[PDB]
Design a protein around this ligand. Structure first.
Ligand code: F6F
Ligand code: F6F
Ligand code: F6F
Ligand code: F6F
Ligand code: F6F
Ligand code: F6F
Ligand code: PLP
Ligand code: PLP
Ligand code: NA
Ligand code: NA
Lengths: 253, 395, 395, 253
């Protein structure tokens, strides 16, 4: 599988950017999370970034910390996250699915076994939030051995060595934090850039693509709609569908 | 590229988000520069001497050892300004912050001692100090919170997650990732990502240096063993560092056994946890079978960091240091013993080290041994804790 | 006949019942012998060094004095084992008791600090310690009572009279009159009958000796003034003794002004009391117009001895030392100032000395002056007192 | 006046010892204390020792501390004690009256003025409890200038220097604490010895006189009867009368 490569080639043919929502697996429960993910896809998500609930989500802001807490209140575990992932791939065969993980959850039962499990359920990429490129060797090797793309964050201040490492070591896409960087990454033949962090309106999706990014990632904005509508699951889905549709339309040429 | 090795064998590293790497690399280069700078060394020494009260005493405990072949000395970190060893390293870290042109200090704290240490150093050195403390800890440590506020520090209660030390650590690191150009993160133990395990050791190593000189003066030879409690690893590594190359000197680190290892309610990850990656490092930790990070339990809240410094894990792996544990009840007995027989009130943290030395003596009372316990702090702070336990079970 | 002069000018003496004279004369001869004995001096020095942590630091306070022509150093008795200067003299008095073949110690205590100091010295030196404390004080000083009991001392609540310090003193002396062959009375200040004002001075005089050496090392000349709080007179006389003959060095003693001299609610007998005979001595005291002995009032219970050591009364009479007073509010402000600007929590007792130095600086900020404040103790013990006041009036 | 000299010469003529009760002036109030003192005299007291309530009666045991407290609860002051003394002497012209004082009360308004006040009201002696002989010079000089006998305690362990000082400096009687000492004091021409402390039964009055003391002092035993009978003043007096009569009879040859 080369799901990201296939996706970007098709989007390029259409002069279109990717729109990629982020949500937490099992927020606010397993069945509703499965419905939410299907709604994001039916509304036009090009790819998914999915978090696995972790006790100490250091690199996440309050909205996403709260999502993890909701998922823990439902008794969600990594094992149940992987059963969910298998069902999602079985329903949607071509959509790229990326995980946002913390290092402990990857390392816990053995790094290789983790990436093997990802391959078995049909995940395409993994971003390990708290592994910097300088210490990523065992992660990215294991990823690649299991046909999993290792994803790296490229910070807005990145120096030249860091840009070269990111361009060399990453695959699938480059996670670019919210025009110089975009051109350098392209210069160094990096995986295509997706812009993430604080993307919450259609206007920011268009702006990212116009700057030369291949697409945009949005999470807080999406998970906010979850949090806001806990009492009304059916309205939750309707609001998610509206927001994703609008955001995806902004990526179209 | 780093200047220094971030690992001790397999343990340690710099497992932080990419955006925090420049802060760690800046810190490391500042440290390496500082360590080669005689003026920095002179300034740090001057504060330790004239402000903090170094060197600290080394006290013999003949009343405790009478009738045995144990000779016991206590390294008196309890006499340091602030009442615990933490003061040594906060002063060096505050000087480092000034070296880097930083005007603000961020610190985390669980039981409040590191919070107070950071606040006092910041007040002395003219730094604006903000301290993250889990809301549950803020509630159970009001004396320490009010000390911090008296010293001009801003105390920020953390409600996220379990509202305890881990959450405080996370909030401190989040803040730092956005403020490191003007703020230094004053991490409170010999753990966390590189360069902090190295820095904190180096800024605590005068404990062992002094101990070596003092024991040579008083006894004409090195100790058979030096014994220190291990919460995160700072006082123990400070005692141990200067003896590592003296291969005949035992290094015994004492983790809290809480209600007992078998009960699961303990804080002994080095010997009874499992290696994970968290807190920016690869180290033994308290964690669930599927990798969620858990808590350490001890009568002594200062020993509740649910992992351990990576140098300790490494020193254990190669057999250079040995780690053991002491229960709450054993620590309480050592606390009472030192009060009664030497007129010194030890911190419950430190009482774990003392309890193990008492065990070494009592189990083999005709074994010739020269022991140093690191008495990491005084136990004025623990007298209500000890009173309430002794009350609850009659007395 | 005595060996030494029991008076300082008109003040002092030995105004005790006839039956207690042999105890006082025995003590005096033991002291005179001890003072000529290099082995006793060596043993006392050894305890001070290796147990108590002498010498104590002398800390400059540039953050407080910035922009003025005052240079301020704090003599750091707060870093002494036990957290106050009282430890120095209890160790000498315990050694004296052993010299005389005594196996028991009797002590009085008001706010509990002398009780704890006596208990810790007794525990170290293997003496059976019994402490008399007024029942009202026992109630308002539970942390100190539990410290004493942890250290193996028997704490005896006194219900007679007003159940405060005077009554404790009386019960201690009553006990001693019947037990002096085997018990030594460990009086807690530079007051009471001869030889105690002399003994306590001599066993505190290392404060000033060290201060002289340290100030000469750091500044190349003696202080313009040394400033110390005066409850009974021990820390002040210990600071002052070695400077008495340096006639250019001011000696300023600070009594508690409480709510203010004019209110009558103060503890400033030296300057605002009237000479009487009580506590075995002729000295200024707090007393009614017809001669009943009264109480001193201060926010700081450690300053509540309702008289003052006779050497202070004498030094004032000849103009060698000057005595002033500081109110509760002034002391509170000095307490907050030192916490915030130096990261040192001072005892409220000591804060009176600091408040007066702050006054010396602020009133005449372009006056060149080199000041030493005796920081007699740390103020961990006072944080709830200070918190509750700062709360009561908003904050 | 030489009331003690007259008393001892008359007692000697009768082969009789002195019986000398101690009570606190104004215990339990002024009027009842005056009645108690008159009852002690009517029952056969040869002399009186009278305490003036003081805030911190160091040298007194709990019974007498309690008596001071009762007197303070009645608002008794030294000035009112001196008015009482004047009335007692006016009623009883020959009985020796001795005060037990603390140094502060003597020194307070001026030592001379104190002893002048004693002379004016007709007191015969003063024992200053907390002035040892070695520091008594200004007290005993002022006493003697005002025809007041200074009284000193002679402890049971007294060395030879102390016995000589006591014998030289005291007048009226020597206060001997409860046979060697008695003979030495007589050898050194001391004032006659009265034995005091724990004298509570007739048998101990006889024993003291047989040992060669001129008499005996009793306080706690007497004040106990006061304390015991606070609710019944009339019975208080009757019990005092019985006890003093019995104790005095034990001193008769
Ligand atoms: O990602 C961040 N913020 C917002 C995006 O995450 P989320 O809001 O959960 O999607 C974010 C914040 C801090 C950070 O560094 C560290 F963890 F070290 F503090 C890394 C990432
Ligand atoms: O993709 C993520 N969040 C969703 C997009 O951001 P937002 O829309 O602001 O929630 C996301 C990605 C990485 C991350 O951690 C680290 F940066 F450390 F790798 C945290 C959150
Ligand atoms: O143990 C720690 N702090 C000690 C606080 O001491 P106290 O105030 O006495 O609880 C501590 C704090 C931070 C840390 O690493 C990282 F920053 F990555 F999270 C590791 C250990
Ligand atoms: O001030 C005194 N003790 C200090 C107690 O200190 P603390 O426990 O801090 O109240 C003190 C105690 C006894 C005394 O003389 C005498 F024994 F004759 F009564 C004079 C002063
Ligand atoms: O007199 C004593 N006991 C009983 C007799 O008095 P009281 O029972 O009041 O008549 C007595 C007890 C102690 C004492 O010495 C000192 F004050 F120093 F403690 C002096 C006298
Ligand atoms: O005469 C006194 N008490 C009454 C007789 O004793 P007791 O019958 O035992 O109460 C009496 C005499 C002296 C004294 O103090 C001191 F000894 F210091 F001078 C205290 C009590
Ligand atoms: C905080 C503390 C400890 C534990 O910290 P380490 O970093 O493991 O030394 C031990 N002793 C005292 C007195 C403390 O305050
Ligand atoms: C008891 C005490 C005082 C007062 O006693 P002095 O005898 O007047 O020195 C002062 N400072 C501290 C810290 C004390 O404990
Ligand atoms: Na730990
Ligand atoms: Na006083």
């Amino acid at each position: 599988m080369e799901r990201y490569e296939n996706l970007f080639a098709q989007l390029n043919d259409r002069r279109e950017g990717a729109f990629v929502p982020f949500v937490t697996l099992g927020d606010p429960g397993i069945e509703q999370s499965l419905k939410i993910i299907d709604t994001l896809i039916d509304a036009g998500a090009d790819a998914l970034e999915l978090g696995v609930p972790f006790s100490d989500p250091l690199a996440d802001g309050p909205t996403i910390q709260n999502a993890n807490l909701r998922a823990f209140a439902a008794g969600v575990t990594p094992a149940q996250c992987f059963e969910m992932l298998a069902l999602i791939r079985e329903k949607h065969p071509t959509i790229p699915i990326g995980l946002l993980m913390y290092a402990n959850l990857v390392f816990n039962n053995g790094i290789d076994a983790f990436y093997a499990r990802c391959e078995q359920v049909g995940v395409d990429s993994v971003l390990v939030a708290d592994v910097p490129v300088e210490e990523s060797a065992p992660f990215r090797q294991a990823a690649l051995r299991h046909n999993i793309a290792p994803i790296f964050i490229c910070p807005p201040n990145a120096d030249d060595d860091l840009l070269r490492q990111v361009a060399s070591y990453g695959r699938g896409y480059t996670y670019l934090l919210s025009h110089h960087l975009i051109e350098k990454l392209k210069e160094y033949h990096a995986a295509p850039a997706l812009q993430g962090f604080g993307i919450s309106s259609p206007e920011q999706v268009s702006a990212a693509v116009r700057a030369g990014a291949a697409g945009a990632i949005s999470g807080s904005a999406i998970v906010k709609i979850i949090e806001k509508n806990l009492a009304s699951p059916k309205q939750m889905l309707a609001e998610l569908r509206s927001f994703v549709s609008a955001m995806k339309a902004a990526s179209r040429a | 590229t780093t200047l220094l090795n971030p690992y001790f064998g397999e343990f340690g590293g710099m497992y932080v988000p990419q955006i925090l790497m420049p802060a760690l690399n800046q810190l490391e280069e500042a440290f390496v520069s500082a360590q080669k700078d005689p003026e920095f060394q002179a300034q740090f020494a001057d504060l330790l001497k004239n402000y903090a009260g170094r060197p600290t005493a080394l006290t013999k405990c003949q009343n405790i050892t009478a009738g045995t072949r144990t000779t016991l000395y206590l390294k008196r970190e309890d006499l340091l300004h602030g009442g615990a060893h933490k003061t040594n390293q906060v002063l060096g870290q505050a000087l480092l912050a000034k070296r880097m042109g930083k005007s603000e200090i961020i610190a985390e704290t669980g039981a409040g001692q590191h919070g107070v240490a950071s606040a006092l150093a910041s007040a002395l050195l003219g730094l604006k100090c903000r301290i993250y403390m889990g809301a549950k800890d803020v509630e159970r440590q009001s004396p320490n919170v009010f000390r911090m506020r008296l010293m001009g520090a801003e105390v920020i209660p953390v409600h996220s997650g379990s509202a305890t030390l881990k959450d405080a650590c996370n909030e401190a690191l989040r803040d730092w990732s956005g403020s490191y150009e003007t703020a230094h993160y004053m991490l409170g133990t010999a753990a966390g990502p590189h360069p902090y395990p190295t820095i904190v050791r180096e800024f605590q190593r005068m404990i062992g240096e002094e101990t070596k000189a003092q024991i040579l003066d008083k006894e004409g030879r090195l100790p058979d063993a030096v014994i220190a409690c291990v919460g995160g690893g700072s006082n123990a590594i400070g005692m141990f560092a200067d003896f590592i190359n003296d291969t005949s000197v035992g290094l015994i680190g004492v983790e809290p056994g809480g209600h007992g290892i078998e009960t699961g309610e303990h804080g002994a990850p080095l010997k009874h946890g499992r290696v994970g990656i968290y807190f920016g490092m690869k180290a033994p930790m308290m964690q669930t079978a599927d990798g969620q990070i858990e808590e350490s339990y001890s009568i002594s809240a200062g020993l509740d960091f649910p992992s351990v410094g990576p140098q300790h894990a490494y020193l254990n792996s190669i057999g250079r240091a040995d780690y053991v544990s002491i229960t709450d009840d054993e620590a309480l007995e050592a606390f009472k013993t030192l009060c009664r027989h030497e007129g010194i009130i030890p911190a419950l943290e430190s009482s774990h080290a003392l309890a193990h030395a008492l065990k070494m003596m009592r189990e083999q009372p005709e074994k010739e041994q020269l022991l140093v316990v690191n008495l990491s702090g005084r136990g004025d702070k623990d007298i209500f804790t000890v009173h309430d336990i002794l009350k609850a079970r009659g007395e």
